[PDB]
Design a protein around this ligand. Structure first.
Ligand SMILES: CC(C)(COP(=O)(O)OP(=O)(O)OC[C@H]1O[C@@H](n2cnc3c(N)ncnc32)[C@H](O)[C@@H]1OP(=O)(O)O)[C@@H](O)C(=O)NCCC(=O)NCCSC(=O)C[C@@](O)(CC(=O)O)C(=O)O
Ligand SMILES: CC(C)(COP(=O)(O)OP(=O)(O)OC[C@H]1O[C@@H](n2cnc3c(N)ncnc32)[C@H](O)[C@@H]1OP(=O)(O)O)[C@@H](O)C(=O)NCCC(=O)NCCS
Ligand SMILES: Nc1ncnc2c1ncn2[C@@H]1O[C@H](COP(=O)(O)OP(=O)(O)O)[C@@H](O)[C@H]1O
Lengths: 1032, 92
């Protein structure tokens, strides 16, 4: 999209990046004046202000300033200060645009005459860039396209100096022929390196001192930001001079950059009652035209659209913006909200309608008293659910809600709203039934929709032969062929895909805007590909022109960028065209018809699908050429294709505002090249009724939709009165063609049926499927991670650590702080006990085998069991059993003795009474100080008194202390019942404590062995006793 | 019951090609277990079926069995046998 930049920005960027042997003067020599600034700083940072004379002009995207007398020339600094006051911040009117002034530019005066007034211009076209040089430039330029010398620089062609000398410098003075030429060359390099689409310096004054740029108007290709953000810096695009932009309108513009969706809003009079929120650019334009046709021009307030599949939150933002802006006034006559649009191909109507549903649930208050009636007309994916959701909600809140589906005309709700009606070489054939396509990108939903369409079209084979995804290895993706399961290959490279599938003749390119150009260039190196569909929106226009030139050279048809694609019923479907399978069946797009159509919009293309299905035999072929300024293929290209196609009988064209493309159709129908009936309607007749230059833009006077509609009418094209009459005129043309007998409608054969998707049946609640798994500790799904009913942010706010998280994940309890601290201490004291034990030994062996962290730790952990690491659990169980049986500690000691069992948790190798373990002491002190009650610990301490009376080293172990204290924590903190604590002991929570604690040490041992670079271990033979049998 | 009627579509999350448990007879890569024993493949033929989905020639199966035999053990001193012995002595 071309966007005009300010004069100051243009000159600054030109000074910074032009490269010429010419002496360019006044580099970075300008001053910016605004009403809300001081002046002393402006004097101090620009010492050139008093050095010579000054000239001041408003930099607010205003042209014809000389003819309107808005410039002060040949007048000094005090002069500019005096001249600002009557105008600075004051009302100004240029033609039909009225607005104040916030921006002026100051530059040194250049003494010059009309003898060196030179006009230079470079503007972009489809075939290349035109440079216009007028020797008698300035105000007296007059007709410039006819008097200034014009030269074409083609796509991927250089502007060479001798071209400038002869074909551009006939009338230039000889003394200034040379350097200017160089300058011009450099200027062109400035034009094409910074992705300018329009760049005019007029006047450009050159004298023996040097060259001076007095003025320049520049439009740059904004979509090229990702290429030029370094060179552009923080480039700004001023709005057209006129009414100040609303904060909500700037909010919508900000929303547009959030994602790939298109989110547009523009105002003319907020005091109007007609308020439209229409999905799809084409649908929005059509609705505006329809309301303006039947008497709503002045009373319509806004014009805007939401498209590109916006999300629920973005729809909330747009809807709450429109309601907030609508609530600013009370209109006693009443207010309407027209919402909907065409049938969506890709936009999830369910989500985009839940968004407005939940945006109007909270806006019932400040709008119910405003007498707002809402008329909806929406179709698309999941429209049958979103429409009736919004109906339920509107009936619940009680606001006037009229729910209409696709069975009604898209613009009938307009008539209901305004009361006019009651409220109830390049080939000719691109695709065939044997067309095989390669899809660039990982688009499984689109490929599955393609395959479902192929199945219901009774195709022998799927239309997708392979997929290309560079970020993965070659594999096979599982897809559905009806109810059967098939495999489609996915290749990392184009080359392998084309090698293994020479029958592929189509590429569907789902590469983003940053990758689409390179993908398409790479694709056109394979001659087997004859048609490329580019889906990405936002490709820079120069790159698209290079694509167009290469495709023309190679004879490759390009369904231009920023398109949903196209559909050939019975044969082939591009990507997401036509929406889901229910829309395919409803519009009967599974069988050929006889009407072939072309349009720019994809939503309008799906609307055309529906209309043509409703009123005629059906669609033979539909193409959406895309919304870019240079489509890969034009309207006239596809019309020529259709005329040469014996299958089609009538051709529908849906043109738009701007561009002289329909006139090629007129020249083909006025002459005898185009003979079949053509029904053409151009949208955008309301563009005249807009008091602005809102961007898809009309440049000249004959490029308006009214001029084109009339021109097609007199050319012999069946042009309806309006869009609302398009269905009836198509119906009448089809009826005449069938009464004559050229069209013989075929018998309606029922299509094959495709089983419903399981996920869609579950969402509708139509099937029952028991869940095979149960879980209660963690909820991954949802906005925030949840640990046993507690959000992770709350886990960190409550300042639980590892112990609290462990309590949540293992017990689903919010443990007291001392419990979590005790759990952490238990993990700390069991972290490691040296390399000699069985688990650490195994982990070290596995690490020295060069193996792996997980493998080594696991090898060590698999020794945890009865003899190693199980004393915690064993001690807890033994002491709990003794305590619960009611026997006193002496009885327990004797009972263990006569059973031939050592007490688990009693005994140390070296440490004894008077030589305490000192990590038994740490834990015991903590438990004594913080636990409310420790009955089992007291019991175990009595047992320890008896056992140390037998011999000193029979002390409570770390295992014994941890086991009994963990039982005490479980059944004495308030979180558990006795049954829960007993169950957690029984199922092995203390085994988990030991395992988690000792994992830290085992990982440490693994890392230690890796750091020491210890080689493979072999056990010495002298340490092994071999006792093999004599001979077995 | 919706799947039996063919009324819904649900993609299978797993693929397998080596063994078919369902059905009247167990199948090893397209070969019934009764045929596996009738054709007198041993461990080597079963391994060929399960690992390569091929009916290997008899000398190939015999060679695979021989390879399994010669790598069966190499004493208790090596790392894997050492770790297994440690874990067994841990009563595990
Ligand atoms: C064109 C595209 C597919 C592009 O796809 P995406 O950009 O989303 O995904 P990606 O290809 O992955 O690109 C992201 C980049 O991030 C990179 N990346 C990923 N992960 C990364 C990581 N971990 N680390 C580093 N990098 C990573 C990745 O490598 C890539 O890098 P790069 O190549 O440099 O770009 C999509 O955007 C688009 O435009 N349309 C969708 C298809 C379609 O059908 N359109 C027509 C709809 S009809 C319509 O409009 C009318 C209407 O709406 C009207 C109504 O409403 O009624 C209706 O419905 O009818
Ligand atoms: C195969 C290869 C390791 C031979 O190694 P080597 O150094 O010749 O011999 P070893 O590493 O087995 O050990 C050498 C000595 O340790 C002794 N030894 C082996 N295992 C022992 C154990 N568990 N306890 C005590 N001594 C042992 C050997 O008897 C030998 O004794 P020697 O010094 O009297 O000859 C070496 O040639 C090589 O690295 N080849 C690369 C190819 C390969 O890795 N093959 C894998 C073998 S299946
Ligand atoms: N820096 C300057 N030095 C000398 N003359 C200037 C300067 N800037 C503008 N002018 C005068 O303004 C006229 C051009 O007006 P211009 O700004 O191009 O009108 P518009 O703003 O409508 O394009 C020239 O004839 C020139 O004499």
């Amino acid at each position: 999209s071309a966007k005009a930049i300010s004069e100051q920005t243009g000159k600054e960027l030109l000074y910074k990046f032009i490269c010429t042997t010419s002496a360019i003067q006044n580099r970075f020599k300008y001053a910016r004046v605004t009403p809300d600034t001081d002046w002393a700083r402006l004097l101090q940072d620009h010492p050139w202000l008093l050095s010579q004379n000054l000239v001041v002009k408003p930099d607010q995207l205003i042209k014809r300033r000389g003819k309107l007398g808005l410039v002060g020339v040949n007048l000094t600094l005090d002069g500019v200060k005096s001249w600002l006051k009557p105008r600075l911040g004051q009302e100004a009117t240029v033609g039909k645009a009225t607005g104040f002034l916030k921006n002026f530019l100051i530059e040194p005066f250049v003494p010059h005459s009309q003898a060196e007034e030179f006009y230079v211009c470079i503007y972009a076209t489809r075939e290349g860039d035109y440079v216009l040089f007028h020797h008698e430039g300035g105000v007296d330029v007059g007709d410039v396209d006819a008097k200034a010398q014009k030269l074409l620089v083609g796509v991927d062609e250089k502007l060479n100096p001798e071209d400038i000398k002869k074909h551009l410098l006939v009338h230039a003075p000889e003394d200034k022929k040379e350097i200017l030429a160089s300058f011009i060359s450099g200027l062109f390099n400035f034009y094409e390196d910074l992705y300018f689409t329009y760049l005019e310096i007029n006047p450009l004054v050159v004298t023996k001192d040097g060259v001076y740029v007095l003025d320049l108007a520049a439009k740059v290709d904004a979509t090229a930001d990702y290429i030029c953000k370094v060179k552009w810096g923080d480039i700004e695009f001023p709005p057209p001079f006129g009414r100040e932009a609303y904060p909500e309108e700037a909010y919508i513009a900000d929303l547009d950059a959030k994602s790939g969706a298109s989110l547009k809003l523009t105002l003319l009079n907020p005091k109007g009652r007609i308020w439209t929120m229409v999905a799809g650019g084409g649908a929005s334009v059509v609705y505006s035209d329809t309301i303006c046709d039947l008497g709503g021009v002045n009373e319509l307030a806004n014009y805007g659209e939401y498209s590109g599949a916006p999300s629920e939150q973005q729809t909330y933002d747009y809807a709450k913006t429109i309601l907030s802006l609508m609530t600013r006034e009370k209109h006693p006559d009443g207010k309407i909200l027209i919402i909907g649009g065409s049938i969506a191909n890709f936009t999830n109507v369910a989500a985009t309608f839940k968004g407005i549903v939940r945006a109007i649930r909270d806006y019932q208050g400040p709008l119910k008293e405003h007498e707002v009636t809402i008329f909806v007309r929406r179709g698309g994916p999941n429209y049958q659910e979103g429409l009736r959701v919004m109906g339920e909600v509107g009936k619940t809140t009680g606001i006037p809600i009229h729910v209409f589906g696709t069975e009604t005309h898209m613009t009938a709700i307009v008539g209901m709203a305004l009361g006019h009606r009651p409220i109830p070489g390049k080939s000719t054939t691109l695709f065939s039934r044997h067309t095989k396509a390669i899809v660039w990108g990982m688009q499984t939903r689109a490929v599955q929709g393609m395959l479902d369409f192929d199945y219901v079209c009774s195709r022998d084979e799927p239309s997708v032969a392979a997929m290309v995804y560079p970020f993965t290895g070659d594999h096979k993706q599982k897809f559905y062929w009806g109810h059967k399961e098939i495999l489609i290959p996915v290749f990392k490279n184009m080359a392998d895909a084309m090698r293994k599938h020479p029958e592929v003749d189509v590429l569907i390119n789902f590469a983003s805007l940053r990758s689409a150009y390179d993908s398409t260039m790479e694709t056109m190196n394979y001659a087997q590909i004859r048609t490329i569909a580019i889906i990405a929106e936002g490709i820079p226009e120069a790159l698209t022109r290079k694509l167009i030139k290469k495709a023309d050279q190679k004879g490759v048809t390009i369904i231009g960028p920023a398109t949903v694609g196209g559909i050939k019923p019975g044969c082939f479907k591009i990507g997401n065209t036509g929406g889901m399978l229910d829309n395919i069946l409803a519009s009967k797009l599974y069988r050929p018809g006889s009407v072939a159509y072309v349009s720019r919009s994809g939503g309008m293309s799906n609307e055309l699908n529906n209309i043509i299905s409703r009123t005629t035999d059906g669609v033979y072929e539909g193409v959406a050429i895309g919304g870019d300024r240079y489509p890969g293929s034009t309207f006239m290209d596809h019309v020529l294709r259709y005329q040469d196609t014996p299958g089609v009988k009538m051709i529908v064209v849906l043109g738009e505002i701007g561009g002289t493309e329909e006139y090629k159709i007129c020249r083909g129908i006025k002459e005898g090249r185009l003979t079949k009936p053509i029904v053409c309607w151009c949208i955008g007749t309301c563009a005249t009724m807009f008091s602005s230059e809102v961007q898809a833009c009309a440049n000249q006077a004959s490029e308006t939709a009214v001029a084109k509609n009339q021109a097609l009418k007199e050319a012999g094209v069946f042009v309806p009165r309006s869009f609302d009459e398009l269905g009836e005129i198509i119906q009448s043309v089809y009826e005449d063609l069938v009464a004559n007998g050229v069209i013989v409608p075929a018998q309606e054969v029922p299509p094959p049926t495709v089983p419903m998707d399981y996920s869609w049946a579950r969402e509708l609640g139509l099937i029952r499927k028991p869940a095979s798994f149960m879980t209660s500790i963690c909820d991954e799904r949802g906005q925030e991670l949840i640990y046993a009913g507690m959000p992770i942010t709350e886990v960190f706010k409550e300042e639980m650590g590892i112990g609290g998280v462990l309590g949540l994940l293992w017990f689903q309890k919010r443990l007291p702080k001392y419990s979590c601290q005790f759990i952490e201490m238990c993990l700390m004291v069991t972290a490691d006990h040296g390399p000699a034990v069985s688990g650490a030994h195994n982990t070290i062996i596995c690490a020295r085998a060069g193996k792996d962290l997980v493998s080594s730790l696991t090898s060590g952990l698999l020794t945890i069991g009865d003899r190693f690491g199980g004393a915690l659990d064993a001690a807890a169980k033994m002491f709990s059993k003794a305590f619960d049986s009611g026997i006193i500690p002496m009885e327990f000691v004797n009972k263990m003795k006569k059973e031939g069992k050592l007490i688990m948790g009693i005994g140390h190798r070296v440490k004894s009474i008077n030589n305490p373990d000192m990590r038994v002491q740490i834990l015991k002190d903590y438990v004594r100080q913080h636990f409310p009650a420790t009955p089992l610990l007291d019991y175990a301490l009595e047992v320890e008194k008896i056992t140390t009376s037998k011999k000193p080293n029979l002390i409570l172990n770390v295992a014994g202390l941890i086991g009994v204290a963990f039982v005490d924590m479980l059944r004495n903190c308030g979180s558990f019942t006795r049954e829960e604590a007993d169950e957690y002991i029984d199922i092995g929570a203390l085994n988990g404590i030991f395992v988690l604690g000792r994992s830290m040490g085992f990982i440490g041992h693994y890392l230690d062995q890796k750091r020491l670079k210890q080689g493979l271990y072999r056990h010495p033979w002298d340490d092994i006793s071999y006792v093999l049998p004599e001979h077995m």
